[PDB]
Symmetry: C3
Subunit: 107 residues, 3 copies
């Protein structure tokens, strides 16, 4: 998948987590979020199509994506421990990082 194809996957999975009832539904959706970032970190968003791979703007994008995989991993551990409530709470903060990263490179 390209960049925004996995970005929209993160957005939809956040909508699945907010309506998920058990911990298995939250965990599987969070792993789909981690998976969507596993193949999209290597892709390039539309705005940075003509930015150097060593350009600080393109470098910012990689690390901003690295925070995302880090927060997703923390919510996965909370959902893995059975804390379905605290994992959904961590998913609401994930929604902030996903939306901020998605709007900065949407164009």
């Amino acid at each position: 998948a390209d960049w925004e194809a996995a970005m929209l996957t993160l957005l939809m999975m956040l909508k699945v987590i907010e309506k998920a009832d058990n911990a298995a539904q939250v965990l599987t959706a969070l792993w789909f979020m981690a998976l969507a970032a596993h193949m999209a970190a290597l892709a390039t968003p539309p705005k940075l199509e003509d930015k150097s791979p060593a350009s600080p703007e393109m470098i910012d994008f990689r690390v901003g994506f690295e925070e995302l995989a880090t927060e997703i991993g923390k919510a996965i551990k909370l959902a893995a421990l059975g804390k379905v409530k605290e994992a959904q709470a961590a998913a609401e903060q994930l929604k902030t990082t996903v939306n901020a990263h998605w709007q900065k490179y949407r164009s």
Copy 2:
């Protein structure tokens, strides 16, 4: 998973997409298809077991697998946008690329 283990995963997920009702069912199955190709592109099919990694026959296999991940990504974006109909239509063309690649290296 080995090569044909993920090939049969693509075939079964295509059967899940053709019977999927909502867009979330199509998107998750398509990401399972992208995931099945993410770890099987690095594996080697049975026929090419004794073919050089730089052999044009083995090289053909890698690129033919690269088309597959590209088509899967396009269907993921269609399913991510909510176009459950057009994503299923793209999945039927995916069935052509999966079956052609699966039969050429099945043996």
Copy 3:
């Protein structure tokens, strides 16, 4: 996800496989197990936090993780062929490798 976050994912997915009714439920959970190992093989467990990357104890961990991905792949192929019974049987042996690896680096 970090190391134990994916370790607990393997444990929960084993509980999903033992209660899965059809072959698609077993296959998807097994691919979640393969996915959980795809990003956790590159992480480091708590005990080996201060062990050299070329240390035989840290080297043992990588190969012990490599057996895990190999067994998961074999159960995926059994579940892909439709053998839902034999794949669940392979999942019970997977439970031995997961639990042995999980307890050796849990601390």
